[PDB]
Amino acid sequence: VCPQGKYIHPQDNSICCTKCHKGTYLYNDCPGPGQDTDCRECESGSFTASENHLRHCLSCSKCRKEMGQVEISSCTVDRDTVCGCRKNQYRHYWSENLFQCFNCSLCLNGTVHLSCQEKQNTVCTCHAGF
Amino acid sequence: VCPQGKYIHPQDNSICCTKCHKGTYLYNDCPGPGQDTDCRECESGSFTASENHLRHCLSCSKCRKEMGQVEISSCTVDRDTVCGCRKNQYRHYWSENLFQCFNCSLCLNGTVHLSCQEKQNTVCTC
Amino acid sequence: DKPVAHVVANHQVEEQLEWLSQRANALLANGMDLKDNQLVVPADGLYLVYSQVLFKGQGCPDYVLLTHTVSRFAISYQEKVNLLSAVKSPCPELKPWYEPIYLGGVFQLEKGDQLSAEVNLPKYLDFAESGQVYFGVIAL
Amino acid sequence: DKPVAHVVANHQVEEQLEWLSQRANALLANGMDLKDNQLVVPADGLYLVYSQVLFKGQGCPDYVLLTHTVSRFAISYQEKVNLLSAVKSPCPLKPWYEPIYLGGVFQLEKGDQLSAEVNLPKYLDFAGQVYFGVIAL
Amino acid sequence: DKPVAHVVANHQVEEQLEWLSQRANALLANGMDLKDNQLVVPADGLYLVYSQVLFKGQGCPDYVLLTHTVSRFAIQEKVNLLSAVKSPCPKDELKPWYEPIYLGGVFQLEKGDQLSAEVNLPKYLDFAESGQVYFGVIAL
Ligand SMILES: Cc1nc2ccc(-c3ccc(N4CCNCC4)nc3)cc2n1Cc1ccccc1OC(F)F
């Protein structure tokens, strides 16, 4: 057991150590109890998005062009790439971590009941029809 | 070598022991020669369908809806679930343990030569 | 001697991929443990990590995408990270289709790391028979 | 030291998946034995059990399903039981190739017999990396 | 004890399938080395050699052929060990398609042999997420 924000030093179970912040990776453990861990900033194309004692950053995801996704936010050291859909589109999620961009329904032969949301199409009602 | 209904105790080659009945699984071996094996009944959704010294029961099968199968008999501790086909259907086996239910062939412009069996369609002259 | 795990799908719970250890020919040994549907490594080391799933479907009414992913929740990190992942589009008389997915690889892991193996659509899994859905770990 | 087996398909016998121990990259060692097309464990223990098969076809004239199954016939439970199983519908006259690979770790007892078979050997592909193997951990 | 490798696709280099070892959840051990995009065996022996790739596409505009090949350069010519071809397209609604390809086999190898795993059209690979493209070697 180490306190919050700390991890147990791998070579010496007495020394007990500061985790690294989002944006950085463990290059080398704390020399000793007082001192800081040698953490270093993620290279371009990689990131760490939480407190860690990882020895390499994680690879940034790329957006799914096959799903018509578009980059909202580029990758950065403390946050993985953020993907979305163009305006006048909505995410259809197939899985927790897999969605597809579809053009919002304009309500042909009908009235837009609920507006087109981000993760849901226009709840959309027909006129005296079907 | 142990006698009928018995198995050799894994930790002690002298002690030689009563197998467990269909419906139960070996929780623990006989302490010694006179005594009985600590066998226990299968939990719901599992079963053992023969004399055993298994350390857990096997999982019940479910029927294949994608093949239009139907439950003949439900699972139970001493017998796995039994699947089949509706009446006016026949099993087509793709593997030893994989069949599909198909509607029996009615013999249009023809005479049913052999009737529709369970694991075979109507030999059918037209 | 070495930690090993072979856990199998629960057939009784369709609509969720739930792993079971207490079954004949399912195993959990030498420190491998199963907590909250995740296999948990008992010591730092190299491990063989694998999982299989079998997806069933009767004709292709609606177009589906299936995903299968094994992921690591490390002490060192503490967010879910993909180790092994795959996607399949099995869809364009209702003829039935079967699509297996097997993932396997070798990984450095630390004591307490939690591995998970899940799919997007459990309803499409095939719990007909045993041996068709499993998730396992072997210490090298 | 530890029992191992890596057996491979017999190419000369199409229409049956027959395992061979003396062959292209094939082995049987330290008590592993091959009797009646089944690998036989020489001692209680943990084992890695694996098999691969490769299915070939030119078109899908009539609809095919392929199955591949590894199964255990234990002393402890004297009935054939699935350890690893899979089904595939390869139907896409375009030619097709479909591998199936199974692997897992299993507790086994001396004398248990493992088998690895498919439903339609005629669809297998003489080409060697059809194999069935067992490694004692 | 035994040489092992699990390397993964570089997402940062689209248009080439470049393997990475210096990465979380990518591994290189017990003599396995990675030089010039090729895994290099540290001793004569039997090896499990495996690779997975995931090919993506949105509808089928142009008809494509995908190949995935693992090959051996023994210590002085390259030999195919594992190969597969896929025509995911109709040659005819633009629905997205996913085509995974897994190759694996056991091979006798000699110290210094260099294994490589490549595809014909990297542009079609799916570097969206991690776990989807890897190349690995395990000494039996
Ligand atoms: C389809 C197949 N073909 C195989 C061929 C060989 C082995 C294999 C061979 C040796 C081994 N060792 C080396 C000796 N010590 C223990 C681990 N571990 C696994 C596994 C094989 N598998 C299954 C498999 C593939 C990829 C990763 C892991 C796999 O096995 C899984 F069950 F761990």
Numbering used by the authors:
A (entry chain E): 14 to 143
B (entry chain F): 14 to 139
C (entry chain B): 10 to 101, 109 to 156
D (entry chain C): 10 to 101, 110 to 144, 147 to 156
E (entry chain A): 10 to 84, 87 to 103, 109 to 156
Tell me what the authors wrote about this structure, in their words.
TNF, like most members of the TNF superfamily (TNFSF) exists mainly as a trimer with a threefold symmetry resulting in three identical receptor binding sites. The mechanism by which TNF induces signalling across the membrane is poorly understood, however, it is generally believed that the process involves receptor clustering. There are currently five approved TNF biologics that work by completely blocking the interaction of TNF with its receptors but to date, there are no small molecule therapeutics available that disrupt the high-affinity TNF–TNFR interaction. Small molecule inhibitors of TNF are described that stabilise a distorted TNF trimer, reducing the affinity of TNFR1 at one binding site and effectively reducing the stoichiometry of receptor binding from three to two per TNF trimer.
In order to further understand the impact of our compounds on receptor binding, we have crystallised mTNF with and without compound (UCB-4433) in complex with a truncated form of hTNFR1 (residues 41–184). The crystal structure of compound-bound mouse TNF (mTNF) in complex with humanTNFR1 (hTNFR1) reveals a distorted mTNF trimer with two copies of hTNFR1 bound. The degree of disruption of one of the receptor binding sites in the mTNF(UCB-4433)-TNFR1 structure was such that only two receptors were bound. Significantly, receptors that were bound were dimeric (described in detail below). In order to highlight the degree of distortion of the, arbitrarily defined, A–C receptor binding site, the UCB-4433 bound mTNF–hTNFR1 structure was compared with the complex without compound by aligning them through monomer C. Monomer A is twisted and tilted down and away from monomer C resulting in their partial separation. The degree of shift was measured for a number of amino acids that are involved in TNFR1 binding and the displacement ranged from 6.2 to 7.8 Å, making it impossible for the receptor to bridge across and bind the two monomers simultaneously, as observed at the two other binding sites. The individual monomers maintain their fold upon compound binding (RMSD of 0.5 Å), so the relevant positioning of residues involved in receptor binding within each individual monomer remains largely unchanged. It is, therefore, possible that receptor could still bind (albeit weakly) to either monomer A or C, however, this was not observed in the crystal structure suggesting that receptor binding prefers contact with adjacent monomers in the trimer to form a stable interaction.
